Design a protein around this nucleic acid. Structure first.
Lengths: 177, 35, 133, 138
RNA sequence: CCAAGUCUGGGCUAAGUGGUAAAGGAUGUGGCGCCGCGAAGACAGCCAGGAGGUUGGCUUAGAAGCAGCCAUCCUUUAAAG
RNA sequence: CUCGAUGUCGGCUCGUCGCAUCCUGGGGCUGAAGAAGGUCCCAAGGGUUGGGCUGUUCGCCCAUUAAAGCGGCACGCGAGC
């Protein structure tokens, strides 16, 4: 949303209210613009979890946003970001999240819980074609069970930029099973 | 009493400033908070 | 002017109703045998009461639909409770049965409508261990 | 930064003796956690402990995860007196590099665990920073 | 005291801090962002009913929010506790 | 620093500070009625005993007492024993 800059001035820039952030795209880049105030708001929403874009000179109103960056620093306040769009029908490198609900199985009865080393899902469905919020939770939880890649259950866009059997999300003893 | 490290008893016990001093107060002998 | 929880068919258990009512202003014996005149129509199952005492040291009064949580137990068949609700949950009951039980408690029970009535049944049977499975 | 004699000649190859990592429960978004800023050969023991007392006060779901762990150690009095000092080991930990990802109170809505960790900081030693993660804490 | 502007400009102190110190506290004070609203006329004053199936499970000799281990739901209605 | 030299333990005497105060006043606290204790904040004025056995201090014991304090100053003092 907006964000400007692109000359050659990171220090002061990298200072005050404007944080660096390259204009990255397949084939071309352009001095860092943006701002340490927009990043906020938007970013605050769900960086590489949905997507939008800003109007700098109406130039090229496109999506793709961030494919890297960091609040690095100790303090925990980012500085020096990466920005890449995608006006193509190739959209792959697509990492969008996936949520459950709380389906009661090991929890609200077994107190047991479940780790989700997954959460996210870098895949590649129908380029410029993804539900900013995709949910899938067949339920199940408790004892020494576990679910991961393999099973899963992918809708429409048949990608999987990923593999089978691997960090899905299981149920462990928040105390004992 | 605790001179050092006072922090709210009864769901009331107030925060007062005497001599810049901060000494707990609240409807209870069981709160005579002071530092 | 006092609320109590006493058994039917019975009336004068030294320990429970001797002290209380006895001091709050109540002739334990009379009210006792007055109770027996009541809970003699629904013995075996506990019955609560709101015995009040004015200015003379006597009287009594109402008997209100016992506390669900427990009346439900008298229907299924289980003394106390597993050991903790939603932690030891394993007391599966049934619908209809349930819907036909709350249809009998309606009285001191919430309003006079199914949904409501039935719902509270699902509530109580939950806090103890009686799952609406 | 004086450190030890080697990873297998003086004292290197241990378990360090402690109480493992993970606790609490999952959670996809909710970012609930703790880190620091202080530098200190984190007092093993003190360490191990601390964190633990953490579970002691909570119990289940709240990423009682914790990303620390000592692995080297000091030494001192053993032998003659003060001069040519050989070495007697004791007390390993790990450098808390001037702040960083401590342990995580990670989960949907379960501050009942935030306060926890909280109780976890209180403890600890080197001050500590109370914080949230990508998003905050819900 | 001892030579040299009790210079001018605009902030911040109300403790003599300055004139040695840490963890640990607190509507101190001054400057920045958030959630709810004041004509569903808002927080702290005042009038009033301070709702019912809630008086569920371990322990009961007593949980029946106001011993503590698990629940955390339904409601006829001014809402919920 | 001192070996072209500062005589070291305990005792004696003569003491002088200090406060985390043993006695003593003033306080708030208590699971404090009384009375007596316990807890902790304020205050050093004054004061805080005879013997025993031990080179000892320390220490245990004997009879007191309100009390029978902790520690400084080369763990004060040999040009004073």
């Amino acid at each position: 949303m907006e964000l400007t800059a692109k000359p050659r001035t990171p220090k002061q820039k990298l200072d005050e209210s404007m944080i660096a952030a390259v204009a990255y795209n397949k084939e071309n880049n352009v001095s860092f613009a943006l701002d340490r105030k927009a990043f906020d708001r938007a970013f605050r929403q769900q960086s590489t979890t949905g997507l939008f874009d800003i109007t700098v000179e109406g130039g090229e109103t496109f999506p793709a946003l961030v494919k890297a960056v960091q609040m690095d620093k100790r303090k925990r306040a980012p500085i020096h970001v990466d920005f890449y769009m995608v006006t193509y029908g190739e959209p792959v490198e697509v990492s969008v999240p996936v949520h459950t609900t709380g389906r009661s199985q090991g929890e609200v009865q077994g107190g047991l819980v479940d780790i989700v080393v997954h959460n996210l899902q870098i895949v590649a469905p129908g380029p410029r074609r993804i539900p900013q919020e995709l949910v899938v939770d067949v339920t199940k939880m408790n004892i020494g069970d576990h679910i991961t890649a393999g099973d899963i259950k992918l809708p429409e866009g048949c990608t999987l930029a990923a593999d089978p059997e691997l960090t899905v999300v299981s149920v462990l003893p928040p105390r004992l099973t | 009493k605790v001179r050092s490290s006072v922090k709210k008893m009864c769901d009331n016990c107030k925060v007062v400033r005497r001599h810049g001093r901060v000494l707990v107060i609240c409807s209870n002998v069981k709160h005579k908070q002071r530092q | 002017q006092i609320k109590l929880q006493l058994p039917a068919g019975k009336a004068t258990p030294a320990p429970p109703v001797g002290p209380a009512l006895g001091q709050h202003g109540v002739n334990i014996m009379e009210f006792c045998k007055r109770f027996n005149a009541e809970t003699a129509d629904k013995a075996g199952m506990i019955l609560p009461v709101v015995i009040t005492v004015y200015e003379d040291k006597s009287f009594t009064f109402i008997i209100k639909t016992p506390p669900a949580s427990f009346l439900l137990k008298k229907a299924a068949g289980i003394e106390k409770g597993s050991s903790e609700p939603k932690r030891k949950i394993v007391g599966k009951v049934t619908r209809k049965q349930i819907e036909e039980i709350a249809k009998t408690k309606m009285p001191d029970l919430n309003a006079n409508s199914l949904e409501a009535a039935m719902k509270i049944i699902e509530g109580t049977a939950k806090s103890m261990g009686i799952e609406v499975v | 930064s004086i450190k030890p004699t080697r990873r297998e000649y003086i004292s290197g190859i241990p378990g360090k003796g402690i109480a493992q990592f993970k606790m609490g429960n999952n959670t996809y978004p909710a970012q609930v956690e703790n880190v620091v800023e202080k530098p200190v050969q984190i007092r093993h023991n003190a360490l191990e402990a601390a964190r633990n007392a953490a579970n002691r006060f909570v119990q289940n779901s709240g990423k009682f995860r914790i990303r620390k762990f000592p692995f080297h150690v000091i030494r001192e009095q053993d032998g003659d007196g003060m001069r040519a000092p050989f070495g007697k080991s004791v007390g390993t930990a790990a450098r808390s590099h001037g702040a960083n990802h401590d342990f995580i109170a990670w989960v949907n809505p379960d501050p009942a665990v935030e306060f926890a960790w909280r109780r976890a900081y209180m403890k600890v030693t080197p001050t500590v920073n109370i914080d949230s993660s990508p998003a905050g804490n819900a």
